[PDB]
Amino acid sequence: GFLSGKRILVTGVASKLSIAYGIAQAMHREGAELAFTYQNDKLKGRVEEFAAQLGSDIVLQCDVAEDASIDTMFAELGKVWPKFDGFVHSIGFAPGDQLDGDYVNAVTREGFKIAHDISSYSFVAMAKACRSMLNPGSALLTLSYLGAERAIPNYNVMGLAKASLEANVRYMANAMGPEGVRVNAISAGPIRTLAASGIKDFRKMLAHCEAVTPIRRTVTIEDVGNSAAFLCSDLSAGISGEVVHVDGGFSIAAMNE
Amino acid sequence: GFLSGKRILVTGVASKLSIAYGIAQAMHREGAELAFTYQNDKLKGRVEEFAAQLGSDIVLQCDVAEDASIDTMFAELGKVWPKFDGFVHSIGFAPGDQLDGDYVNAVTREGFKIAHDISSYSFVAMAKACRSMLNPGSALLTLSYLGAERAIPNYNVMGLAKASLEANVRYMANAMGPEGVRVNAISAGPIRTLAASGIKDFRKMLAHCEAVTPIRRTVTIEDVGNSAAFLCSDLSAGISGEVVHVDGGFSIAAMNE
Amino acid sequence: GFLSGKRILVTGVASKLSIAYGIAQAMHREGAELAFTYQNDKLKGRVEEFAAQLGSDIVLQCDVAEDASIDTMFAELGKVWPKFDGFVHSIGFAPGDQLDGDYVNAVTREGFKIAHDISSYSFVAMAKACRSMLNPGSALLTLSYLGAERAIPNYNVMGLAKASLEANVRYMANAMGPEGVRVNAISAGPIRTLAASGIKDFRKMLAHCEAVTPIRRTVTIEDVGNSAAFLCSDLSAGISGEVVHVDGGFSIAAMNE
Amino acid sequence: GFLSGKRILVTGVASKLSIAYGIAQAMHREGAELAFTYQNDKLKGRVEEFAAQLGSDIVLQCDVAEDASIDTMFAELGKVWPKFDGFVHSIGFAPGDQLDGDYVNAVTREGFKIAHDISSYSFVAMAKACRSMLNPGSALLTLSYLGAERAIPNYNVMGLAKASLEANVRYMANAMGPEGVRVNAISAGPIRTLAASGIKDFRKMLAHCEAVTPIRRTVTIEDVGNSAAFLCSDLSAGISGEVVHVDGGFSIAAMNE
Ligand SMILES: NC(=O)c1ccc[n+]([C@@H]2O[C@H](COP(=O)([O-])OP(=O)(O)OC[C@H]3O[C@@H](n4cnc5c(N)ncnc54)[C@H](O)[C@@H]3O)[C@@H](O)[C@H]2O)c1
Ligand SMILES: NC(=O)c1ccc[n+]([C@@H]2O[C@H](COP(=O)([O-])OP(=O)(O)OC[C@H]3O[C@@H](n4cnc5c(N)ncnc54)[C@H](O)[C@@H]3O)[C@@H](O)[C@H]2O)c1
Ligand SMILES: NC(=O)c1ccc[n+]([C@@H]2O[C@H](COP(=O)([O-])OP(=O)(O)OC[C@H]3O[C@@H](n4cnc5c(N)ncnc54)[C@H](O)[C@@H]3O)[C@@H](O)[C@H]2O)c1
Ligand SMILES: NC(=O)c1ccc[n+]([C@@H]2O[C@H](COP(=O)([O-])OP(=O)(O)OC[C@H]3O[C@@H](n4cnc5c(N)ncnc54)[C@H](O)[C@@H]3O)[C@@H](O)[C@H]2O)c1
Ligand SMILES: Oc1cc(Cl)ccc1Oc1ccc(Cl)cc1Cl
Ligand SMILES: Oc1cc(Cl)ccc1Oc1ccc(Cl)cc1Cl
């Protein structure tokens, strides 16, 4: 596969529906050696099982709300992978009350702070912590959504956090490019995952996209996984600082209704 | 003037160099009645003096880091302006250590949090607090910078905070439009102000822009003020959720060097 | 008014519904001296009448498909206005068969050529012809539509012509800025005009926009006219090469349905 | 390879420096069966030789300025490939006088017409002609440049033609997606090719990009070729209507100087 010889860390697997799960599958298929993190014990079991199926026994705990947790996870990873080739950041969070109803009425200073901290700061927090461990030719990848570009009902403060994240991708790419590290994002279309259930009326968003997307279907975690594998491989050596839309063309059409 | 009959609150005046000062001047010239806020006692004197020169005696303290301070300022403003027509948000902040050198090395969880809280959350915090006091036809305005769209050396975490702010403009415009409130931003080119001195090599950024901007000069607080007055007036009734570049065309050219 | 002392040429008035008509009204209200062009004799009468109502007796024929017609019109204008302050380009055209049905099936080499020639090339053709007649501080303005940015059903080849036009705005602004000329565009939302009737299902586009636009109404030629007056005045001295959306926020929202 | 079983037509090979040459090499490496076109006899020899080295004996003449030439080439291709999986459009042209100096002074109605006809219309002209021959799952690809988005000195009218081309990509993707065809573009950074020598001061553009691009080197035809192979493969099934920047991050940074 085109990922043979690469060692990549994958965050965010919570279930078989997880976008990170589709990404891990595609990268394994292409020959990458993988390592996984899990947020807490509530998820340790499932992640350990999935990692086994994908030939990996490197499963480490990591809660990105804490600098100490990130530093410890990398010190542990370093015992087996003193150097590696990048990681996939597939993590997002905002308190549930933030994602329902009128945005101005729903947002709070605390909800805003947590959404940006976990959904955007954590990406550069991880890069800071493992910077000296990355091989030249390494690639970092995060996942965004159209809500960063347009106002979407109910997505609310997560939209602002994703806009901060896309800017993060550009500043990170500009800072780390000289040492040989590329940084990109995939702006994925709507997919039924555990976290998606937290967005009010998500099922309605899904049906709408299916009807108006140029390719006439919503994307799958396999579609996203294949794109992620490409973006973390040497085949995309000429691409950095980019937000690639993997939504079947939904965002470039208007009034298809 | 085209602002006759409008009552507008202006935040951010710190000196005669302040963009908010140029905005206040232009709005006064066009007939608006004004009210001003000041961050702390270190600035109370200058703001009181400027307000007098512009025919206003409404000068209130307001530190947007605190919900209580925002609520109190509006309760006080309500004693004289039970209803009004919008406000100008010209406030930004990030700890100084954040704006020097390599972005990944300089950014910290705390610096990131403060930058987003003061530079982006505060805009919707103010709208939440005065929502019931706005007249139909009201307009809110904030100030952004190109760093939200492109990676610019030294601007660092402020770029991410401005990206969150531009997204804020869109979600706010979408939420408040039905009740008759418009929300926009001006992305201004570089101008020598007090805060600008905190950006490493700002004088270099200024000279560069002057040489490559299509109109061959950097913009002034008068240029920005005139645009702000238009965007807060009924003359721009058809514009909401927009980020207008007032940088002399700098951002739409490349390689003019 | 803020246009006092300015001499502006207005193209494209075909009826009282014309966007150019709303623009002429607003500029006259703000004090500008105006001059008008008309495409052919089929329209001469109406334009002569409107010009009179707006205190102007400068009404010249000009068909932008011909270089000779443009050169002659300016030589004639020069007899009364040896120098002037800019013009409004409110002209578009594509053969009717191009605007109905599947884009790939409808487009032809000839339809494509005519659409780009009349809708985009004509803007720089006029600037080339009157370049030596423009006063420093002059401003040129054209009208675009969201179809330049997103694929919209039935708009078809006009979308490509508008994309070429928006690029034209940037190259023109970059080339003419050093001599003191600004160039911008307004991307207007849907408005019932004579030309609009040529777009299949235009009435459907109008109703849809009204329902999902943040300000909850479609824009009027007065909204566009007011913005145009501002953009051609010295109040927008800091703005060049920009495409300003005057569509009530329609383009920055998604899934409001 | 991930292109095994795909039959792709490649246009634009003129020499070993050609972007189309790098694309053909990468696609051959990944298992695609290829076919090539050549503009005229001046190029027939070189193309025949290259095609042989890549295991292909399908080399057909095609000048996209003529509808008849396009129809004939496809009728001939149909004798060997009654159905196929897409094509690569790597064709551009504008008269040389258009690419030197001030844009407004250099552009002519004829130069503008030819630039748009050959550089943008030809892409949809080819799709129209072979539409019934494409297998479900097919993908079309064209090559663009940053000049479509920003004003770049000397690129002049080609910038407008590339803006029309990027819009073409979106309208084509929207029209053909329902039948299973994806359409995308790669916006490549500067590369020394035969056509590049026609741009005044191209060597200066190249050195500048090398110094300020995040990855600190200009991209190669191999970088572009690898991205093109991915975008024409089933691995990018979730991507359509997109313009992917393969310029090492150059466009997302500002003032790196
Ligand atoms: N689902 C969609 O339609 C969609 C669309 C675009 C983007 N995304 C993005 O894709 C990513 C993955 O989401 P998903 O839909 O696969 O959801 P998911 O619920 O399968 O995964 C989200 C993951 O975030 C992790 N997470 C949350 N807080 C964390 C913390 N403090 N520390 C460590 N991990 C934490 C969870 O443990 C979980 O594995 C997110 O960035 C999301 O915003 C999803
Ligand atoms: N100066 C430039 O070139 C430029 C370019 C683009 C945008 N801007 C933006 O314009 C706005 C005004 O900046 P400026 O350059 O006029 O600077 P300035 O230093 O004159 O004004 C900044 C203001 O922010 C206020 N402020 C900071 N923290 C605050 C808090 N907690 N509560 C209340 N007020 C607080 C200060 O008191 C001060 O009045 C900012 O949003 C800035 O990001 C400036
Ligand atoms: N109507 C809308 O909803 C809308 C939305 C966005 C942009 N626009 C743009 O606004 C401009 C004005 O359109 P409108 O809707 O007011 O239509 P309209 O039919 O009132 O005006 C179009 C004008 O184009 C002129 N014209 C066409 N070919 C010409 C030629 N060869 N030479 C000289 N003049 C020529 C006509 O004479 C007419 O005055 C166009 O650029 C159009 O694309 C309209
Ligand atoms: N070279 C760069 O730095 C760069 C950057 C971005 C985009 N591009 C684009 O990549 C494509 C390929 O350019 P290149 O640099 O490889 O140049 P090149 O000179 O190697 O190839 C250009 C090709 O266009 C073909 N062509 C021109 N007119 C034609 C006509 N009427 N019919 C058929 N074929 C015709 C030529 O025969 C030639 O093979 C163009 O679209 C160009 O705009 C090049
Ligand atoms: O970003 C997303 C976008 C979509 Cl359409 C669906 C799910 C997404 O992911 C999340 C949404 C809300 C929260 Cl609280 C956490 C996550 Cl991970
Ligand atoms: O956003 C800005 C952009 C520029 Cl070019 C100059 C000054 C700016 O404003 C600030 C920059 C840094 C900090 Cl700490 C605070 C503020 Cl108000």
Ligand SMILES: Oc1cc(Cl)ccc1Oc1ccc(Cl)cc1Cl
């Ligand atoms: O650009 C437009 C956009 C809209 Cl929504 C409505 C009308 C427009 O203007 C035209 C549309 C088609 C043709 Cl043939 C000519 C013109 Cl002037």
Ligand SMILES: Oc1cc(Cl)ccc1Oc1ccc(Cl)cc1Cl
């Ligand atoms: O688009 C291009 C962009 C760059 Cl930076 C270099 C070469 C390019 O390609 C061309 C440029 C001019 C002409 Cl006349 C023809 C072609 Cl193919």
